[PDB]
Design a binder for this molecule. Structure first.
Ligand code: UP6
Ligand code: UP6
Lengths: 217, 218
């Protein structure tokens, strides 16, 4: 996946007008947009097609899929039907649940991103201790795309070590949550940025600023 | 706690609006609490919650297994309650702050949070099971009153009931298609969740009626 400027916009605004306007203001800097439930549950799944129609961007559905196999399959189908290019899935629910997603992705020509360790404080309670094993599980299942925490570069580095250089790794927690753009890119292929851009007084300047800080990368 | 008719909750996971509406309408005389998840919502929109309320006089539990950071969890809960859901199911594995975010929104909006502890599928044994007792303990400490536990593992469901106490409300999926027994599950859970055994039946109403007949004494 060739992410322009190694920057993925997490569009979590909950108003169609604002979401489209802000994305439009930073369109020259990105070609990959991550849409999650905040926007989808507020405006509907048709918003994905609208983004592709207006921006011709790659779409990652950050749905944190975390159900049983049968339900995970249905969620992935509905998501790809809406035009998503990839979907983010939790690894904590186990191998069968991840495999369910991989099957649908393969059938519809899409990608599955395995979330191994989250970036918020609460991730330390249960997820962190299982993160390395979840990553190894991904490797065993043939997963090639992963999600790791910008807020813990040592953990992000460990994830990169487990999955190898060939695997693709994206990382949220940059900016608002405290992660540093440049440091995160030492290990991740692309950084995910939400609020630091979409809540900025001038989103375009915010995006341009982040890119300037990682220009040599 | 919510008064679930016949201690039976329908997991409406059909992805077609017409079929979902038909089946739910056919079993409404037996069930007054319906659980709507992403298979239907991502296929027909959040307005489907409103339509179910309009068409049927049923309570709605949004089975969204909320599992994001606090900031995003709050947004998901807000949008879901705004749509008319009476309650929402949240994962406990992402930690206390993520669960607290959901509880805060539920409190401010006058709705309820159900904490999913251990799941009923085989994969749950890999990571969730080992953290389930603590996840439940965490819920109790946070003031969570509603929980979800696995019907497929009677011993685990029993332990979870002990941890949360008799005053807490517990619902349990995995009944029927996944192997759980209605009666056995009701020894510990206040209500059972049933999806496919009802919605894939040739006569959903008869299927629901049959399940209720098997637990009549309960
Ligand atoms: O471990 C994490 C942390 N955050 N996110 C998501 O990445 C974005 C981070 O946004 P932010 O830049 O505004 O913090 C949000 O969409 C959030 O749900 C994840 O997928 N996993
Ligand atoms: O641990 C579990 C297992 N299943 N479910 C949900 O309960 C329903 C079970 O449906 P079934 O009766 O068709 O197996 C589905 O909506 C499934 O996502 C949960 O919330 N948690």
């Amino acid at each position: 996946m060739d992410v322009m400027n190694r920057l993925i916009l997490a569009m979590d605004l909950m108003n169609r007008d604002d979401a489209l306007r802000v994305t439009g203001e930073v369109r020259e800097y990105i070609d990959t947009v991550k849409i999650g439930y905040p926007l989808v549950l507020s405006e509907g799944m048709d918003i994905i097609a609208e983004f592709r129609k207006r921006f011709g961007c790659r779409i990652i559905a950050n749905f944190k899929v975390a159900d049983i196999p049968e339900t995970n399959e249905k969620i992935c189908r509905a998501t790809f039907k809406a035009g998503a290019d990839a979907i983010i899935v939790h690894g904590f629910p186990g191998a069968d649940s991840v495999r369910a997603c991989l099957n649908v992705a393969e059938e519809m020509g899409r990608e599955v991103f395995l979330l191994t360790e989250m970036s918020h404080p609460g991730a330390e309670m249960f997820i962190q201790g299982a993160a390395d094993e979840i990553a190894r599980m991904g490797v065993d299942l043939g997963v090639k795309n992963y999600v790791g925490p910008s807020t813990r570069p040592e953990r992000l580095s460990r994830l990169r070590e487990i999955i190898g250089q060939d695997s693709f790794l994206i990382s949220p927690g940059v900016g608002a949550q405290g992660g540093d753009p440049g440091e995160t890119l030492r290990f991740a292929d692309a950084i995910i940025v939400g609020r630091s851009i979409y809540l900025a007084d001038n989103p375009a300047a915010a995006a341009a600023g982040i890119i300037e800080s990682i220009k040599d990368l």
